[PDB]
Amino acid sequence: DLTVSLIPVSGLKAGKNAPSAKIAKLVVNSTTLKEFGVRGISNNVVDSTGTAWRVAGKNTGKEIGVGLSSDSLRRSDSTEKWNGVNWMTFNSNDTLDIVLTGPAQNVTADTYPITLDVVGYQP
């Protein structure tokens, strides 16, 4: 199996943010498995690979756009299919960046839940 951490990056502020601003770090370790696939989980998945999606604030209901950073996407080993569903795969024993996607976003002060699905893959 895999041991997964999802760690919030500190000192994120409301208002206009930097493009590709870091909001979380995903850590995936295994002693048995060489790779893993990762997808974001939400009501609004905005690309074919579930690597960009939208999350709603708890108190205001406002949406932000979140996903894997460009550099993290580029470190991908492959895009595989599981029951016809696209999963991007990465090397185990590595970390990835979760970021505010696209051009600079104006983030309303709130708490936003971020949920990731991770699975083991053998090439």
Binding site: D1, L2, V4, L6, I7, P8, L12, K13, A14, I23, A24, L33, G37, I41, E80, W82, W87, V107, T108, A109, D110, T111, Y112, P113, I114, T115, L116, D117, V118, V119, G120, Y121, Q122, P123
Partner: peptide, 19 residues
């Protein structure tokens, strides 16, 4: 290659944008 269904984990955290 192939996926390992039993190894699948959902994981979530709260991110906070503060004034």
């Amino acid at each position: 290659g192939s996926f390992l269904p039993n190894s699948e984990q959902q994981k979530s955290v709260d991110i906070v944008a503060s004034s």
